[PDB]
């Protein structure tokens, strides 16, 4: 069974996918959400922060103590609170907050501090030996949502573009593009034809079937 480590009260939990990849899950307002923790030889890298600065601080502190290294970088996958709500903490700690330009533009528009706006449609990053690819597949859950791919593990972080099995509808679609969303999913499936695991933005880890589930929800 996968190792699962929790904070006091269960508001933050980390679950191990492999030697260097963990999923981090927090309970916001109850609404759980997921991101990743990458344990690299040059520091810890997160995919996404959390709902607010209190949770982001506690996540950072938990992983820095456990893995005995600093969080250096975070990839922000869209400009909603579940993903970006800890940006003030990141900036004041000197943690690099990577994003697309559009995500940064939307964060500013909505009153958050701005991530770097450095990610392109395809960006390849390397942290120690850990390779990370970011990909903008098109509009879907939001205008700006990106996915993150770990090519050494064929793990896809779908983020909120990808719904878990337990999601029975599309959720909050105020900022969504429900026509383009199917094409954007298809763009992910075309880019990454052999996928080991898919981490949705909310709910249980699954596999490619979560992408097919999302397509069905969009009918
Ligand atoms: O669906 C999403 O991924 C997002 S980030 C939606 C969203 C849309 C706009 C503003 C805030 C949110 C967060 C949210 C709000 C209510 C939720 C209920 C159930 C499950 C997840 C939920 C997430
Ligand atoms: Zn969202
Ligand atoms: Zn979300």
Swiss-Prot record:
Activity control note: Inhibited by captopril stereoisomers and iodoacetate. Also inhibited by chelating agents such as EDTA.
Residues the record lists as binding Zn(2+) 1: 78, 80, 141
GO terms under cellular component: periplasmic space
Role noted for this protein: Confers resistance to the different beta-lactams antibiotics (penicillin, cephalosporin and carbapenem) via the hydrolysis of the beta-lactam ring. Active on cephalosporin and penicillin.
Protein name (database record): Metallo-beta-lactamase type 2
Keywords for this protein: Antibiotic resistance, Hydrolase, Metal-binding, Periplasm, Signal, Zinc
Gene name per UniProt: blm
MF annotations from Gene Ontology: beta-lactamase activity; zinc ion binding
Binding site for substrate: 163, 172
Species of provenance: Bacillus cereus
Major localization listed first in the record, in broad terms: periplasm
Cell location: Periplasm
Residues binding Zn(2+) 2: 82, 160, 202
PROSITE patterns in UniProt: BETA_LACTAMASE_B_1 (PS00743), BETA_LACTAMASE_B_2 (PS00744)
InterPro entries in alphabetical order: BcII-like_MBL-B1, Beta-lactamase_class-B_CS, Metallo-B-lactamas, NDM-1-like, RibonucZ/Hydroxyglut_hydro
Subunit structure: Monomer.
A Pfam family assignment: Lactamase_B
